[PDB]
Amino acid sequence: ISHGRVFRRMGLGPESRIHLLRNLLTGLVRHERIEAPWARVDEMRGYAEKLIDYGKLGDTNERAMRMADFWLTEKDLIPKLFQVLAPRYKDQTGGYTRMLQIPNRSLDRAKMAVIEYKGNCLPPLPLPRRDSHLTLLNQLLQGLRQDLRQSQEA
Amino acid sequence: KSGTWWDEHLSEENVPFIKQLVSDEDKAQLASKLCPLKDEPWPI
Amino acid sequence: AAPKNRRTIEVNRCRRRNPQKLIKVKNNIDVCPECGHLKQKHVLCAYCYEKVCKETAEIRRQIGKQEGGPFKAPTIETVVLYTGETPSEQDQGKRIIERDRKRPSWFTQN
Amino acid sequence: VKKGFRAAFRFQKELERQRLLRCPPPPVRRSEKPNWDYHAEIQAFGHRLQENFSLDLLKTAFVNSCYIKSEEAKRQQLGIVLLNLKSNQELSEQGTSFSQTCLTQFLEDEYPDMPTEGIKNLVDFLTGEEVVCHVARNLAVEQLTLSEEFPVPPAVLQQTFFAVIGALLQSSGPERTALFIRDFLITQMTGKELFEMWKIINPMGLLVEELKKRNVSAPESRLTRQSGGTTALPLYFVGLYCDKKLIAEGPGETVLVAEEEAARVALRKLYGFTENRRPWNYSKPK
Amino acid sequence: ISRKWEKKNKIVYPPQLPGEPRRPAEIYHCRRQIKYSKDKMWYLAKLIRGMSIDQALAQLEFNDKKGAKIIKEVLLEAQDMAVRDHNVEFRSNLYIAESTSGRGQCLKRIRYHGRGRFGIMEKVYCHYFVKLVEGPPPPPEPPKTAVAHAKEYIQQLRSRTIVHTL
Amino acid sequence: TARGTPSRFLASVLHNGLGRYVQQLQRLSFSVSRDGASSRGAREFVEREVIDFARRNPGVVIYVNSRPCCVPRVVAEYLNGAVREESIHCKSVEEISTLVQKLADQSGLDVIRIRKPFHTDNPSIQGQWHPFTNKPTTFRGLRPREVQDP
Amino acid sequence: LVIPPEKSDRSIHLACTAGIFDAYVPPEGDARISTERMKKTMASQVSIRRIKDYDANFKIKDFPEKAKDIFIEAHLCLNNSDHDRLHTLVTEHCFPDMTWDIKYKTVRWSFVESLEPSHVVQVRCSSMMNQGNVYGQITVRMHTRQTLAIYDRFGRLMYGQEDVPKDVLEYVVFEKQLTNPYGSWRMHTKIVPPWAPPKQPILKTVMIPGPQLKPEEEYEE
Amino acid sequence: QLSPTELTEMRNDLFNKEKARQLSLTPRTEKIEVKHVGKTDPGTVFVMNKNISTPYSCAMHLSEWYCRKSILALVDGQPWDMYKPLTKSCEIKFLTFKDCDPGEVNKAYWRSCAMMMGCVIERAFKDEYMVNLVRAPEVPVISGAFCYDVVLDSKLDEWMPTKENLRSFTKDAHALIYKDLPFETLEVEAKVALEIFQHSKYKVDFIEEKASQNPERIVKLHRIGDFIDVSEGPLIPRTSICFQYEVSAVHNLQPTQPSLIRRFQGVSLPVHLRAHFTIWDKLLERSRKMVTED
Ligand SMILES: [Mg+2]
Ligand SMILES: [Mg+2]
Ligand SMILES: [Zn+2]
């Protein structure tokens, strides 16, 4: 039974799980886009979002600095978190990362995902785009919308 | 032959419109049943 | 516990060729509009994703040359500028990674 | 490797049987195969049938026009008259006419109540390609037939068969030939039903006209028996009554089918082709 | 060993007559000595039977089994060979007429067990055979309907004779 | 066994014997070695027996072919197209006569299981039985427990 | 396979050359007609002499009739795949070009009529003792009506028509081995003029694939 | 005049005759070079047969995906039916329902659905009553329903179709879809078209207008099964493209004094863009309202 168990069992135990996730998060902050098994990226995505919130507290917040010191194994990245990543999302309250499934890994056919911090300088991923508003179905609905708005104003 | 779902082919503009449209009809349908005794009830 | 009798090919065919054991047909394969190669509806196109990765790798090698060592991450934002382009007003104060090629069409300047 | 030769030879024979079975060879004329003497085969043909054929006429009966035209084409191709071979066209016409008139006489005497349309259909069935070719093939007519194409076309085989009847007519006369037609063509009606040979449509319509000719009231259809009316396997017996007297009764899976079958039963009784009618008399004429 | 499958692309038929129907092109291709199990390969060969060349290629491109890549490789070179050497007009107008795997020449190796005991391990190889026929894929058989059963049942009732008598 | 072999119904060739009897044996082909010992009985059959057998059966064309052979054979062909090859290897002249006479009397149909020891196209003269054959009819054909004129 | 074993006394005995000694370029508009002239003729006369040297009883006038016979019989071997007889009528340079592409195809070719008599346009000889062998090539011009219908492996009409004859103007080159005591005259190759009209179209439609570009690469017109 | 069944046999014979004539003009098998100018498969050249090979044949050279997704062809920048033979060396592009701007594809599907309505309406009424096909008005897709103007018999001047009758028309349209009939096209001169549609006055007037617009006075003819009609532009390849198809309402146009023109209306979605049951019902409601072409 595992009702309401929100965390996955990975690595060699609870500690190794954190270390596994910490290495993925450290790589993400440096490179701003990484690929890894889908489940591991999905688990780490929660930490990657909260790290920005700690970065927004500022480098003068001792609690935020201790959190960043633990989760960033490369100390040159701690200035980046507080002075590059956190200011970039100053005007957002969430959704700092985007996660997309990519083709299965060649060797072991593992389900794979790419995760990146939005607003990076890297070439954009081929994001999935919705059908154009000019398609047959969307034009039929646009007419239905126009009609309803006209009937309400009357 | 490929499976489809309701908002598969809907564009960014039509997804909010459809959600609002169907939601309002549900609310209107439920509110219309609040007077059972005034709508030809069966013998009590 | 060992097998008491040999299992016949008739029995084995019923087990091996059962519909559960067969490979299921996939109905979520579609053509990629950008490149024309096949893709799954919920997965990124392999051909397009590889193209993006190749350019991402080239830019990352350039970033390495500018950093010139470990533990040298910048404290300012970065902008990739291709041949024939100069920094914009919004690109001031950002590390400029110069790429010796023409800007890819799919890569839009911002 | 084992010593010996017999086992290998025996296996070679079987390997040739399997090779042949996998790839059956195209059929060829019996004349092209070994052990064939046309003159001897022609003589045995008549003796089997207990008929004193004229070897001159019998040989001509087998010669067809297609074989003559092709034989000449081969002569021209080889740059080689001596091919003044008479075809069986004349003999075929004589035999065909005699057979039709002879069969019409046999059938009219046996079943005096069958109209001309019925008797014509029976004669057309007995002289048809299917019936005639079946009889001809089982009498070695195809083996002795000289044709351009093998297997012999059905129309060519039918023509050759009637040529043999013509040859018998000139050789032995009509009485001897009448027995031949009785023994090999009339016999083909042994177990076959009237309407299996005479294909008709709308039997009820034909019955109504016949009863009018006989000055009998129109037949009234009535349900004599019934079972499983509401099921997927009904049984209906529909009886036709003329002046409230049963003339025929027929079963069927539906009332319409049973009614139509009853009309056929009424027609069979009217014409004398009942299943239990007197069998044909094949005894030697007195 | 036998190599009859490669000799079937060398059969020259005689010129067709003016009134005969156009004969579909048939292309036989195979790959020999694949380091993969024939039992596992059978499932992939079973998948694409009767499929169009394009549908089979799509199914194999998104399969996780190792045999899928090999079969896709064989199908592509067979498709190219059909148009290049067998006078097939449209490369897409092809369907899988036959696809099956065969046993290859295998090697034996020792597998070690405890207590000084051993087993004999087989390094398995397999063949893959494919036949491509020109034309659209044949339609699947419609499920036997209730009308067909009822017609068949009544047919068996009607062929029923009185047994062991005249 | 019956289940492992084919079968047929008793039948004739072109209703043989109905109007007239026609011998079905149509051709006989012998192959007798001049010097082979196995063909000794076949040579003795060709010297005194084959000529008298042909006189009695003028409808059968017999082909005697003398050629080197280790196994002498006789091939019988019938009007219906059946071909039968029978060995006469090392058989006596009396044994060969019996075999040849047996071939002369056969119809050429397959010597396989015959389902019934009799055949007829008119099994019934009074009407084949059906469930209503011996059932009495009822006034107005009323069914059991059926109310009339309601 | 390019060279046999090294330091071997035995060598490969070639019976033909791989190309034409001096390619004869036909005058433009020769199909329409259907100082330098002497210089070319003198070169032909010189070469003809060395041809009559090894074979005294040689006549240039008789060759165009013989050339047509070799040409017709060589093409007739393609109809029945009589390769054994073909090697005697064609050289080892011509044999691959004639038969390689029709190995699994049915060729129905026929000769109808000869519009214009054959004319020996050029006669030339090889450099003396290339490897102890001397060759003589006689270019001939043929204007004849031919019928060709090629079928594919499955007996389906692939090219041409089986009953419509069309005009063919082609300059067939022959070659003989003079030194060989058993050498003969054999079809060697064909000259295709640049101005020659394009061949009749094929029956089936064709697609020419564009560049297969890897992800990093981009399509440039 | 000719009976309805004989009228189709005459029109089909004339249509077939003109088709055979245009095919004979082709000298043997002339070859054209068609360059692919699409974003995918760039640079592909097709060496096709003039006046025989259609855009569909070019898609067949590429893959089955092109054949299934291509609804319309863009030949030298002009919309081109998938089954219309190519006449010259040109550039070709393939259009789908899901393109960034599928305006042209929408019109083709939108025109084809109207033509399928005309087919069922002509063959739905009893032989007693006369059905006179008028035209297929060009109404924008955003209007919510495609319309087809028809003139019915004087006897049916007070008759309005019932809901079961509207459902009867829909079942006939779906039968046309199940048959999977191709849209055969023919570009003929006004004279040929006028002969085919001589018995119908409205078509003659309509045919004359289209011929006048073009200097060469060639009119575009289309046929599905045994139904021939005149069109405004290129159509879709086959009727099997339609998945959801229903005729919604029949309106009586005004003024009714000269003649009572009845506007039959419907709405449909292809297989590629099929809508959900709930969403489809909302579209049927708007389709039942009268549309006024502008
Ligand atoms: Mg684990
Ligand atoms: Mg040990
Ligand atoms: Zn892509």
Curated annotation (Swiss-Prot), chain A:
One of its GO terms (biological process) is mitochondrial translation. The gene is MRPL17. It is found in: Mitochondrion. Component of the mitochondrial large ribosomal subunit (mt-LSU). Mature mammalian 55S mitochondrial ribosomes consist of a small (28S) and a large (39S) subunit. The 28S small subunit contains a 12S ribosomal RNA (12S mt-rRNA) and 30 different proteins. The 39S large subunit contains a 16S rRNA (16S mt-rRNA), a copy of mitochondrial valine transfer RNA (mt-tRNA(Val)), which plays an integral structural role, and 52 different proteins. One of its GO terms (molecular function) is structural constituent of ribosome. NCBIfam families: L17. Gene3D superfamilies: Ribosomal protein L17. Detected in adrenal gland, mammary gland and adipose tissue. It comes from Homo sapiens. PANTHER family: LARGE RIBOSOMAL SUBUNIT PROTEIN BL17M, RIBOSOMAL PROTEIN L17. The keyword Transmembrane does not apply. This is Large ribosomal subunit protein bL17m. Its main location: mitochondrion. It holds the Pfam family Ribosomal_L17. Belongs to the bacterial ribosomal protein bL17 family. One of its GO terms (cellular component) is mitochondrial large ribosomal subunit. Keywords: Mitochondrion, Ribonucleoprotein, Ribosomal protein, Transit peptide.
From Swiss-Prot, chain B:
Component of the mitochondrial large ribosomal subunit (mt-LSU). Mature mammalian 55S mitochondrial ribosomes consist of a small (28S) and a large (39S) subunit. The 28S small subunit contains a 12S ribosomal RNA (12S mt-rRNA) and 30 different proteins. The 39S large subunit contains a 16S rRNA (16S mt-rRNA), a copy of mitochondrial valine transfer RNA (mt-tRNA(Val)), which plays an integral structural role, and 52 different proteins. It comes from Homo sapiens. Belongs to the universal ribosomal protein uL3 family. It is linked to Combined oxidative phosphorylation deficiency 9: A mitochondrial disease characterized by failure to thrive, poor feeding, hypertrophic cardiomyopathy, hepatomegaly, and psychomotor retardation. Death in infancy has been observed in some cases. It is found in: Mitochondrion. It comes from the Eukaryota. Transmembrane segments: none annotated. This is Large ribosomal subunit protein uL3m.
Swiss-Prot record, chain C:
The keyword Iron does not apply. One of its GO terms (cellular component) is mitochondrial inner membrane. MRPL32 precursor is processed by the m-AAA protease (composed of AFG3L2 and SPG7), which cleaves the N-terminal transit peptide. Cleavage by the m-AAA protease takes place prior to assembly into the large subunit, an essential step for mitochondrial ribosome (mitoribosome) assembly. Proper processing by the m-AAA protease is dependent on the zinc-binding region within the tightly folded C-terminal domain of MRPL32: zinc-dependent folding halts degradation initiated from the N-terminus and triggers the release of mature MRPL32. This is Large ribosomal subunit protein bL32m. Belongs to the bacterial ribosomal protein bL32 family. The gene is MRPL32. It comes from the Eukaryota. One of its GO terms (biological process) is translation. Its main location: mitochondrion. Residues 86-110 are annotated as: Disordered. Zn(2+) binds at C32, C35, C45, C48. Component of the mitochondrial large ribosomal subunit (mt-LSU). The mitochondrial ribosome (mitoribosome) is a large ribonucleoprotein complex responsible for the synthesis of proteins inside mitochondria. The chain holds residues 79 to 188 of 188 of the full protein. GO terms for molecular function: RNA binding; structural constituent of ribosome. It is found in: Mitochondrion. Keywords: Mitochondrion, Ribonucleoprotein, Ribosomal protein, Transit peptide. Residues 91-103 have a biased composition (Basic and acidic residues). It comes from Homo sapiens (Human).
Swiss-Prot record, chain E:
GO terms for biological process: mitochondrial translation; translation. The gene is MRPL22. Belongs to the universal ribosomal protein uL22 family. Its main location: mitochondrion. Signal peptide: none annotated. Keywords: Mitochondrion, Ribonucleoprotein, Ribosomal protein, Transit peptide. The keyword Ribosomal protein applies. Component of the mitochondrial large ribosomal subunit (mt-LSU). Mature mammalian 55S mitochondrial ribosomes consist of a small (28S) and a large (39S) subunit. The 28S small subunit contains a 12S ribosomal RNA (12S mt-rRNA) and 30 different proteins. The 39S large subunit contains a 16S rRNA (16S mt-rRNA), a copy of mitochondrial valine transfer RNA (mt-tRNA(Val)), which plays an integral structural role, and 52 different proteins. This is Large ribosomal subunit protein uL22m. GO terms for cellular component: mitochondrial inner membrane; mitochondrial large ribosomal subunit; mitochondrion. It is found in: Mitochondrion. It comes from Homo sapiens. One of its GO terms (molecular function) is RNA binding.
